Coordinates of C-alpha atoms and ligand atoms in Angstrom, one line a residue:
Chain A
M1 CA -16.5 18.9 -11.3
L2 CA -17.3 16.4 -7.9
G3 CA -18.3 19.2 -6.5
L4 CA -17.4 18.3 -2.8
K5 CA -18.7 20.5 0.1
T6 CA -16.0 19.1 3.1
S7 CA -14.1 21.7 5.0
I8 CA -11.0 20.0 4.4
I9 CA -10.7 16.0 3.9
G10 CA -11.5 16.6 0.3
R11 CA -10.6 20.1 -0.3
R12 CA -8.6 18.6 -3.0
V13 CA -8.1 14.5 -4.0
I14 CA -6.0 12.8 -6.8
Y15 CA -7.6 9.8 -8.4
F16 CA -5.4 7.2 -10.4
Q17 CA -6.6 4.1 -12.9
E18 CA -4.3 2.5 -11.0
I19 CA -0.7 3.0 -8.3
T20 CA 0.9 0.8 -6.1
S21 CA -0.5 2.1 -2.8
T22 CA -2.1 5.5 -1.4
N23 CA -0.7 5.0 1.7
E24 CA 2.7 4.8 0.1
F25 CA 2.3 8.1 -2.4
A26 CA 0.5 9.9 0.5
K27 CA 3.4 9.9 2.6
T28 CA 6.1 10.1 0.1
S29 CA 4.4 13.2 -2.0
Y30 CA 4.1 16.7 -0.6
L31 CA 0.7 17.1 -0.2
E32 CA -1.5 19.5 1.6
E33 CA -3.4 18.5 4.8
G34 CA -7.3 17.3 3.4
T35 CA -5.6 15.9 0.1
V36 CA -7.3 12.5 -0.7
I37 CA -5.6 9.6 -3.1
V38 CA -7.8 7.5 -4.3
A39 CA -7.2 4.0 -7.0
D40 CA -9.1 2.2 -9.1
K41 CA -7.0 -0.4 -7.7
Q42 CA -3.4 -0.5 -6.3
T43 CA -0.9 -3.3 -7.4
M44 CA 1.2 -2.9 -4.2
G45 CA -1.7 -2.1 -1.3
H46 CA -0.8 -3.6 2.4
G47 CA -2.6 -3.5 6.0
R48 CA -1.2 -3.6 9.1
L49 CA 3.0 -4.5 8.5
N50 CA 3.4 -4.8 4.5
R51 CA 0.5 -7.6 4.9
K52 CA -1.0 -7.7 0.9
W53 CA -4.3 -6.0 0.8
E54 CA -5.6 -7.3 -2.0
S55 CA -7.1 -3.8 -4.0
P56 CA -9.1 -5.3 -7.5
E57 CA -11.1 -2.5 -9.4
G58 CA -14.6 -2.6 -7.2
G59 CA -13.2 -1.8 -4.2
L60 CA -12.7 1.9 -2.2
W61 CA -9.0 2.3 -2.0
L62 CA -8.0 5.9 -0.4
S63 CA -5.7 7.7 2.0
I64 CA -6.1 10.7 3.6
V65 CA -3.4 12.9 4.6
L66 CA -3.8 14.3 7.8
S67 CA -1.8 17.8 10.5
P68 CA -3.8 17.6 13.4
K69 CA -3.2 19.6 15.6
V70 CA -4.8 18.2 18.5
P71 CA -2.4 16.9 21.5
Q72 CA 0.2 14.1 21.1
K73 CA -1.8 11.8 23.3
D74 CA -5.0 12.0 21.0
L75 CA -3.0 11.4 18.1
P76 CA -3.7 7.7 17.9
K77 CA -7.4 8.1 17.8
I78 CA -7.3 8.5 14.1
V79 CA -7.6 5.2 13.2
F80 CA -11.0 5.3 14.8
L81 CA -11.9 8.4 13.1
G82 CA -10.9 5.7 9.4
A83 CA -13.1 2.9 11.2
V84 CA -16.0 4.9 12.9
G85 CA -16.5 7.3 9.3
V86 CA -16.7 3.9 7.1
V87 CA -19.4 2.5 9.5
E88 CA -21.5 5.3 9.4
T89 CA -21.1 4.7 5.2
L90 CA -22.1 1.4 6.2
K91 CA -25.3 2.6 7.9
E92 CA -26.7 4.4 5.2
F93 CA -26.2 2.1 2.8
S94 CA -27.9 -0.2 5.9
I95 CA -25.4 -2.4 5.8
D96 CA -24.5 -3.7 9.6
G97 CA -20.7 -2.5 10.4
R98 CA -18.9 -3.4 13.8
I99 CA -15.9 -2.5 14.6
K100 CA -12.9 -5.3 15.8
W101 CA -10.7 -3.2 17.6
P102 CA -8.6 -1.0 16.3
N103 CA -9.5 -0.8 12.9
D104 CA -11.2 -3.9 11.2
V105 CA -14.9 -3.6 9.6
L106 CA -16.6 -6.2 10.2
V107 CA -20.8 -7.0 9.0
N108 CA -21.2 -10.6 10.6
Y109 CA -17.6 -11.7 11.4
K110 CA -16.5 -10.7 7.7
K111 CA -14.0 -8.5 6.6
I112 CA -15.7 -5.8 5.2
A113 CA -13.3 -2.9 5.7
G114 CA -9.9 -2.1 7.3
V115 CA -8.2 0.9 8.3
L116 CA -4.2 1.9 7.8
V117 CA -3.1 4.8 10.0
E118 CA 1.2 5.6 9.4
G119 CA 2.4 8.8 10.8
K120 CA 6.3 11.0 10.2
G121 CA 6.2 13.8 12.3
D122 CA 3.2 16.6 12.0
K123 CA 2.1 14.6 9.0
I124 CA -0.8 11.0 9.2
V125 CA -1.6 9.2 6.8
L126 CA -4.5 7.6 6.9
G127 CA -5.6 4.8 4.9
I128 CA -9.3 3.0 3.8
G129 CA -10.1 0.3 2.6
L130 CA -13.5 -0.6 1.9
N131 CA -14.7 -3.9 -0.5
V132 CA -18.0 -2.3 -2.8
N133 CA -18.4 -4.5 -5.7
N134 CA -14.9 -6.7 -6.0
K135 CA -14.1 -9.8 -5.1
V136 CA -12.8 -10.3 -2.4
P137 CA -10.6 -12.7 -0.6
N138 CA -12.0 -15.3 2.5
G139 CA -12.6 -14.3 4.9
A140 CA -14.1 -10.9 3.8
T141 CA -17.3 -9.6 2.5
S142 CA -18.2 -6.6 0.2
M143 CA -20.9 -4.1 0.3
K144 CA -22.4 -5.7 -2.5
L145 CA -22.1 -9.0 -2.0
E146 CA -24.3 -7.7 1.8
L147 CA -26.7 -6.0 0.0
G148 CA -27.1 -8.1 -3.0
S149 CA -26.1 -5.6 -5.2
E150 CA -24.1 -3.5 -7.1
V151 CA -23.6 0.2 -5.6
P152 CA -23.0 3.0 -7.2
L153 CA -18.4 3.4 -5.7
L154 CA -18.7 7.3 -6.5
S155 CA -21.8 7.4 -3.8
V156 CA -19.6 5.4 -1.3
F157 CA -17.0 7.6 -1.9
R158 CA -18.9 10.8 -1.4
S159 CA -20.9 9.6 1.9
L160 CA -17.3 8.5 3.5
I161 CA -15.8 11.7 2.7
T162 CA -18.7 13.6 4.0
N163 CA -18.7 11.1 6.8
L164 CA -14.7 11.4 7.4
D165 CA -14.8 15.6 7.2
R166 CA -17.2 15.9 10.1
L167 CA -15.5 13.4 12.2
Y168 CA -12.1 14.9 12.0
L169 CA -13.2 18.6 12.7
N170 CA -15.2 17.7 15.6
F171 CA -12.5 15.5 16.9
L172 CA -10.4 18.3 16.6
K173 CA -12.4 20.1 19.3
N174 CA -13.5 17.3 20.8
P175 CA -10.8 15.0 20.6
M176 CA -12.4 12.5 23.5
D177 CA -15.9 12.0 21.6
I178 CA -14.4 9.7 19.0
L179 CA -14.3 7.5 21.8
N180 CA -17.8 7.7 21.9
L181 CA -18.8 7.1 18.5
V182 CA -16.0 3.7 19.0
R183 CA -18.1 2.0 22.3
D184 CA -21.0 2.1 20.2
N185 CA -20.0 0.7 17.1
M186 CA -17.2 -1.6 18.6
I187 CA -17.3 -5.7 19.0
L188 CA -17.9 -6.5 22.7
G189 CA -19.0 -8.3 25.3
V190 CA -17.4 -11.4 23.3
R191 CA -14.5 -13.7 23.9
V192 CA -11.1 -12.5 22.1
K193 CA -7.6 -14.1 21.4
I194 CA -4.3 -11.3 21.9
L195 CA -2.5 -12.0 19.8
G196 CA 1.3 -10.5 20.2
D197 CA 4.3 -11.0 22.6
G198 CA 3.0 -14.5 23.5
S199 CA -1.2 -14.2 23.6
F200 CA -4.2 -14.5 26.5
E201 CA -8.1 -14.6 25.9
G202 CA -10.8 -13.0 27.9
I203 CA -14.0 -10.9 27.1
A204 CA -13.5 -7.7 26.3
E205 CA -15.6 -5.8 27.9
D206 CA -14.6 -2.4 26.5
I207 CA -12.1 0.6 25.3
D208 CA -11.2 3.1 28.1
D209 CA -10.3 6.8 27.9
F210 CA -7.3 6.1 25.7
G211 CA -8.8 3.4 23.6
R212 CA -7.2 0.3 24.7
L213 CA -9.1 -2.6 24.8
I214 CA -9.8 -4.1 28.2
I215 CA -9.7 -7.5 28.9
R216 CA -11.1 -9.5 31.5
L217 CA -9.1 -13.0 31.9
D218 CA -11.0 -15.7 33.6
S219 CA -9.5 -15.5 36.6
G220 CA -10.3 -11.9 37.0
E221 CA -7.0 -10.0 35.7
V222 CA -7.9 -7.2 33.9
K223 CA -5.4 -6.1 30.8
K224 CA -5.1 -3.2 28.8
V225 CA -4.0 -3.6 25.3
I226 CA -2.2 -0.7 23.4
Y227 CA -2.8 -0.1 19.4
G228 CA 0.4 -1.5 18.1
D229 CA 1.8 -4.6 16.7
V230 CA -1.1 -7.0 18.4
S231 CA -3.7 -8.6 16.6
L232 CA -7.4 -9.6 17.8
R233 CA -8.9 -12.5 17.2
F234 CA -12.6 -13.6 18.3
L235 CA -13.0 -17.4 19.2
Chain B
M1 CA -13.0 5.4 -7.6
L2 CA -14.1 6.8 -10.7
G3 CA -13.4 3.8 -13.6
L4 CA -12.0 5.7 -16.1
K5 CA -11.3 3.8 -18.8
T6 CA -9.1 6.4 -21.2
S7 CA -5.6 5.3 -22.1
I8 CA -3.7 8.4 -21.9
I9 CA -6.0 11.6 -20.8
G10 CA -7.4 10.6 -17.3
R11 CA -5.0 8.2 -16.3
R12 CA -4.6 10.9 -13.6
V13 CA -7.1 13.5 -11.9
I14 CA -6.3 16.0 -10.1
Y15 CA -9.1 17.7 -8.3
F16 CA -9.9 21.3 -6.7
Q17 CA -12.3 22.4 -4.9
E18 CA -10.6 26.0 -5.7
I19 CA -8.1 27.1 -7.7
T20 CA -6.5 30.5 -9.1
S21 CA -6.0 28.5 -12.4
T22 CA -5.8 25.1 -13.7
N23 CA -3.6 26.2 -16.0
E24 CA -1.3 27.8 -14.5
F25 CA -1.2 24.5 -11.6
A26 CA -0.2 22.5 -14.7
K27 CA 2.3 24.4 -16.0
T28 CA 4.0 24.5 -12.9
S29 CA 3.8 21.3 -11.4
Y30 CA 5.5 18.2 -12.6
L31 CA 3.2 16.2 -13.5
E32 CA 3.4 12.7 -15.8
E33 CA 1.2 12.8 -19.3
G34 CA -2.1 12.9 -19.3
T35 CA -2.9 14.2 -16.1
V36 CA -6.0 16.3 -16.1
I37 CA -6.4 19.3 -13.2
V38 CA -10.2 20.3 -12.2
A39 CA -11.6 22.6 -10.4
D40 CA -15.0 22.9 -9.0
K41 CA -14.5 27.2 -9.2
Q42 CA -10.9 29.3 -10.7
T43 CA -10.2 32.6 -8.3
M44 CA -7.4 33.9 -11.0
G45 CA -8.9 31.9 -14.9
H46 CA -7.9 33.5 -17.5
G47 CA -8.4 33.2 -21.1
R48 CA -6.1 33.3 -24.6
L49 CA -4.7 37.3 -23.7
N50 CA -4.7 38.9 -20.4
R51 CA -8.5 38.5 -20.3
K52 CA -10.6 37.1 -16.8
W53 CA -12.2 33.7 -17.7
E54 CA -15.5 33.7 -15.3
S55 CA -15.2 30.2 -13.8
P56 CA -18.4 30.0 -11.1
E57 CA -19.7 26.7 -9.3
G58 CA -21.2 25.1 -12.1
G59 CA -19.0 25.0 -15.5
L60 CA -16.0 22.7 -16.4
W61 CA -12.9 24.1 -15.7
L62 CA -10.1 21.6 -16.5
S63 CA -6.3 21.5 -17.3
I64 CA -4.7 18.2 -19.5
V65 CA -0.9 17.7 -20.0
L66 CA 0.8 16.2 -22.6
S67 CA 4.3 15.8 -24.3
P68 CA 3.2 15.2 -28.3
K69 CA 6.1 13.0 -29.4
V70 CA 5.6 15.2 -32.7
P71 CA 7.3 17.3 -35.3
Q72 CA 6.8 20.7 -33.8
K73 CA 5.0 22.0 -36.8
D74 CA 2.1 20.3 -35.4
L75 CA 2.1 21.4 -31.7
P76 CA -0.4 24.4 -32.6
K77 CA -3.2 21.7 -34.0
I78 CA -3.3 20.8 -29.8
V79 CA -5.9 23.9 -29.1
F80 CA -8.0 22.1 -32.2
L81 CA -8.2 19.1 -30.7
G82 CA -10.0 21.2 -27.1
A83 CA -12.3 22.6 -29.7
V84 CA -13.6 19.6 -31.6
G85 CA -13.6 18.0 -28.6
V86 CA -16.2 20.1 -27.1
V87 CA -18.0 19.9 -30.3
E88 CA -18.1 16.5 -29.9
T89 CA -19.2 16.3 -26.4
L90 CA -22.5 19.2 -26.9
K91 CA -24.2 17.0 -29.6
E92 CA -23.8 14.2 -27.1
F93 CA -25.7 16.5 -25.0
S94 CA -28.4 17.7 -28.0
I95 CA -26.4 20.7 -28.6
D96 CA -25.0 22.1 -31.9
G97 CA -21.4 24.1 -31.4
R98 CA -19.3 25.6 -34.2
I99 CA -16.0 26.7 -34.2
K100 CA -15.1 30.5 -34.0
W101 CA -11.6 30.1 -34.8
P102 CA -9.5 29.3 -33.4
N103 CA -10.1 28.2 -29.7
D104 CA -14.1 29.5 -28.8
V105 CA -17.0 26.9 -29.0
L106 CA -20.4 28.7 -30.3
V107 CA -24.0 27.4 -29.9
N108 CA -26.8 30.2 -32.0
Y109 CA -23.4 32.6 -31.5
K110 CA -23.8 32.4 -27.8
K111 CA -20.1 31.5 -26.3
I112 CA -20.7 28.3 -24.5
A113 CA -16.8 27.5 -24.5
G114 CA -13.3 28.6 -24.7
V115 CA -9.9 26.6 -25.5
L116 CA -6.1 28.4 -24.2
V117 CA -2.9 26.0 -24.4
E118 CA 0.0 27.0 -22.8
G119 CA 3.7 25.4 -24.2
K120 CA 6.1 26.8 -22.0
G121 CA 8.8 23.7 -22.7
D122 CA 8.7 20.0 -22.3
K123 CA 4.7 19.9 -22.0
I124 CA 2.2 21.4 -23.3
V125 CA -0.7 22.4 -21.2
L126 CA -4.4 21.8 -22.7
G127 CA -7.1 24.3 -20.8
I128 CA -10.6 23.9 -21.7
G129 CA -13.0 26.4 -19.9
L130 CA -16.8 25.2 -21.0
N131 CA -19.9 26.5 -18.9
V132 CA -22.4 23.9 -18.1
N133 CA -24.7 25.0 -15.0
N134 CA -23.3 28.2 -13.8
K135 CA -24.2 31.6 -14.6
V136 CA -22.5 33.2 -17.4
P137 CA -20.8 37.2 -18.2
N138 CA -23.9 38.7 -20.7
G139 CA -23.9 37.2 -24.6
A140 CA -22.7 33.7 -23.6
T141 CA -24.4 30.7 -22.6
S142 CA -24.5 27.3 -20.5
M143 CA -25.0 23.7 -21.3
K144 CA -28.3 24.4 -18.8
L145 CA -29.6 27.3 -20.6
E146 CA -29.5 25.2 -24.0
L147 CA -31.0 22.4 -22.6
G148 CA -33.1 24.6 -20.0
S149 CA -32.2 21.5 -17.5
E150 CA -29.4 20.8 -15.1
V151 CA -26.6 18.4 -16.8
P152 CA -24.8 16.4 -14.7
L153 CA -21.4 18.2 -14.3
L154 CA -19.9 15.0 -13.9
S155 CA -21.1 13.4 -16.4
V156 CA -20.0 16.1 -18.7
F157 CA -16.4 16.0 -17.5
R158 CA -16.6 11.9 -18.5
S159 CA -18.1 12.6 -22.2
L160 CA -15.4 15.1 -22.6
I161 CA -12.1 13.4 -21.7
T162 CA -13.4 10.5 -23.7
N163 CA -13.4 12.6 -26.7
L164 CA -10.2 14.2 -26.2
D165 CA -7.8 10.7 -25.1
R166 CA -9.4 10.1 -28.9
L167 CA -8.7 12.5 -30.4
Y168 CA -5.4 12.5 -28.9
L169 CA -4.4 9.1 -29.7
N170 CA -5.0 9.7 -33.1
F171 CA -3.7 13.0 -33.2
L172 CA -0.2 11.4 -32.6
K173 CA -0.4 9.0 -34.7
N174 CA -2.4 11.1 -37.8
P175 CA -2.0 14.7 -37.5
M176 CA -3.2 16.4 -40.0
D177 CA -7.1 14.1 -39.5
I178 CA -7.6 16.9 -37.0
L179 CA -8.1 19.6 -39.6
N180 CA -10.8 18.3 -41.7
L181 CA -12.6 17.6 -38.3
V182 CA -12.3 22.0 -37.7
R183 CA -13.5 22.6 -41.0
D184 CA -16.1 21.0 -40.4
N185 CA -17.5 22.0 -37.8
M186 CA -16.2 25.8 -38.2
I187 CA -17.8 28.8 -38.7
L188 CA -16.8 29.9 -42.4
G189 CA -18.3 31.8 -45.3
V190 CA -18.6 34.9 -43.2
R191 CA -17.2 38.7 -42.9
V192 CA -15.0 39.4 -40.1
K193 CA -12.2 42.0 -38.9
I194 CA -8.8 41.4 -38.0
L195 CA -8.1 44.0 -35.3
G196 CA -4.2 46.2 -33.7
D197 CA -2.4 47.6 -36.3
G198 CA -2.7 46.8 -39.9
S199 CA -6.1 45.6 -39.0
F200 CA -8.2 44.4 -42.1
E201 CA -12.0 42.7 -43.3
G202 CA -12.7 39.8 -45.6
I203 CA -14.7 36.6 -45.4
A204 CA -13.4 33.8 -43.7
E205 CA -12.8 31.3 -46.6
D206 CA -10.9 28.1 -44.3
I207 CA -8.0 26.9 -42.1
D208 CA -5.2 26.1 -44.1
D209 CA -2.4 23.3 -43.5
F210 CA -0.7 24.7 -40.4
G211 CA -4.6 25.9 -38.5
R212 CA -4.2 29.6 -40.2
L213 CA -7.7 31.3 -40.9
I214 CA -7.6 32.1 -44.9
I215 CA -9.5 35.2 -45.4
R216 CA -10.2 37.2 -48.7
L217 CA -10.3 41.1 -48.8
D218 CA -12.8 42.8 -51.0
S219 CA -10.0 43.6 -53.6
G220 CA -9.5 39.7 -53.7
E221 CA -6.0 39.7 -51.6
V222 CA -5.7 36.6 -49.6
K223 CA -4.4 37.0 -46.3
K224 CA -3.2 34.3 -43.5
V225 CA -4.1 34.8 -40.1
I226 CA -1.9 33.1 -37.6
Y227 CA -2.2 31.7 -34.2
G228 CA -1.1 34.3 -31.2
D229 CA -2.2 37.9 -30.1
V230 CA -5.7 38.3 -32.6
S231 CA -8.7 39.4 -31.7
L232 CA -11.5 38.0 -34.1
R233 CA -14.6 39.9 -34.7
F234 CA -17.4 38.8 -37.2
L235 CA -19.0 41.1 -39.2
Ligands
BT5_1 N1 -9.6 -6.6 0.4 C1 -9.6 -7.0 1.4 N2 -10.7 -7.4 2.0 C2 -10.4 -8.1 3.2 N3 -9.4 -8.4 4.0 C3 -8.4 -8.3 3.1 C4 -8.2 -7.9 1.2 N4 -7.0 -7.7 1.1 C5 -6.7 -8.5 2.3 N5 -6.7 -9.2 3.3 C6 -6.2 -9.9 4.1 O1 -6.8 -9.2 5.5 C7 -5.7 -8.3 6.8 C8 -5.4 -7.3 6.6 O2 -4.2 -7.2 7.0 P1 -4.6 -5.3 8.5 O3 -5.7 -6.5 9.2 O4 -3.5 -5.5 9.7 O5 -4.7 -3.9 7.4 C9 -6.0 -3.6 7.4 O6 -7.2 -3.8 7.3 C10 -5.1 -3.0 7.3 C11 -5.5 -2.4 5.3 C12 -5.5 -1.0 4.5 C13 -6.0 -1.1 3.0 C14 -6.1 0.1 2.3 S1 -6.2 0.3 0.8 C15 -5.7 2.0 0.6 C16 -4.3 2.3 1.5 N6 -3.7 1.8 0.8 C17 -2.7 1.4 1.1 O7 -1.9 0.4 0.3 N7 -3.0 0.3 2.4 C18 -4.2 1.2 2.8 C19 -4.0 -8.9 5.3 O8 -3.3 -9.8 6.6 C20 -5.1 -9.8 3.8 O9 -4.6 -11.5 4.3
BT5_2 N1 -17.4 31.8 -18.7 C1 -17.4 32.2 -19.8 N2 -18.3 31.9 -21.0 C2 -18.3 32.1 -21.7 N3 -17.4 33.3 -22.2 C3 -16.9 34.1 -20.8 C4 -16.3 33.8 -20.1 N4 -16.1 33.9 -19.3 C5 -15.5 35.3 -19.6 N5 -16.1 35.1 -21.1 C6 -15.4 35.7 -22.4 O1 -14.5 35.4 -23.2 C7 -13.6 35.6 -23.8 C8 -12.2 35.0 -23.8 O2 -11.0 35.7 -23.9 P1 -11.0 34.5 -25.0 O3 -11.0 33.8 -26.1 O4 -9.0 34.8 -25.4 O5 -9.9 33.3 -24.1 C9 -10.3 31.8 -24.0 O6 -11.6 31.0 -24.3 C10 -10.5 30.5 -23.4 C11 -10.6 30.4 -22.0 C12 -9.8 29.0 -21.8 C13 -10.5 28.6 -20.4 C14 -9.8 27.5 -19.3 S1 -10.9 27.1 -17.6 C15 -9.6 26.2 -17.2 C16 -8.3 26.8 -17.9 N6 -7.8 27.4 -16.4 C17 -7.5 28.8 -16.7 O7 -7.0 29.7 -16.4 N7 -8.5 29.0 -17.8 C18 -8.3 27.8 -18.9 C19 -13.3 37.2 -22.9 O8 -12.3 38.2 -23.3 C20 -14.1 37.1 -22.2 O9 -15.1 38.2 -21.6

């Protein structure tokens, strides 16, 4: 009854009034590629590790099952598909979303969305949490807060699914294309602090051909940060 | 992201762009009570007894998983729950539908919806097909044809699920209530013919406490028609 016209993402949609976590349900259940798991609220939503992701009613909490047939070397770029998809949807609603490498979307440096990709073999789960009309924690913002008025959640869902399907289809044929879109929508040219096994500061210059964040330290040393157990902090 | 407020029916919804039959999928898949299976189009939609149910885009094709902890005796009234639900939704949209025993909903004697209940063991599958914006078979009708305008399909879905949840919750406590609702919304006092072996004709007087159609033959003989492979023609 939703009348989705996408090719892969959105072929099927499983909606829940409440769920523990759409990413967990998607990882655990036997699902077809393109199936979207979405819930009004999550009781055990999580980000990066197992850090809690606030998922109250009013936001868009979903996960997408993917089985990309592209080269193994390209797989790490799925998180960017989610971030760019969110940015494109935000621009459709006239909200200035910008990507904070590697998985966050900010509006005036406040976190409006987070992307979490989890994989086990050939099955990849793309999770996206976007604050729409819900209350948010400190350090965050929402579409409603930025626009000053409520936004139809279903409209945001339709927009995002349409964008993700297009991005995913093109990723299958041109896996390098997404990097261009990321660079064009990412926060760069500013000082950042990279937190991981230790920490260092420098200018976030760009992302390379593998999506690694290129940082120029003050002494001129160039470091390449790869996606993993590393966080980014703006100064 | 649908924000459904129902108690049981609609706690979970599985949407398909395309499916063979929502009833078949509901019967062969483990699903919690209240799960709704809905699709934009069915390629193998079917009716009460070996007949195809045209399910093109624009219509509302869905199935609901139920597991009524009620006496065996009542199980056969589930079809009425669907029929009455459709009648209530149509009324909300300014359409006067009437029930043609035992599972049809007509508008000015033109079929606008059909109900199909299948008990395959543990669960009971309540299937409902309602013509909204889709093209229909000759002699049939749709909400769009009745209103002369495009009706938002999702609004019809929301309305119907809301009505069905209420009817079902009440049914679990007061199983006989549905009968009078059917009587007040069913086509009675007219002549009908029961086809097949032992065929006969008479006036459809009412439905009894078991949902059987009570027919008065011209001879004065009274016959009770049960659910099943029954074919009924208005004379
Ligand atoms: N609603 C919210 N908006 C902005 N920040 C939040 C937030 N809820 C919690 N936070 C904070 O932001 C941090 C998020 O950590 P990360 O940057 O590593 O992590 C992320 O940004 C990934 C979040 C993915 C969420 C979606 S919801 C659908 C799917 N199902 C799930 O269970 N997860 C995914 C936490 O440390 C929190 O303190
Ligand atoms: N779309 C339509 N609108 C009105 N009449 C139709 C129609 N499609 C077919 N018909 C005719 O109406 C009669 C219907 O037969 P019955 O009275 O036995 O049967 C019914 O009316 C029950 C139909 C149930 C349909 C739903 S769709 C969701 C779920 N998934 C399924 O596969 N089925 C259920 C047939 O003899 C057809 O000629």
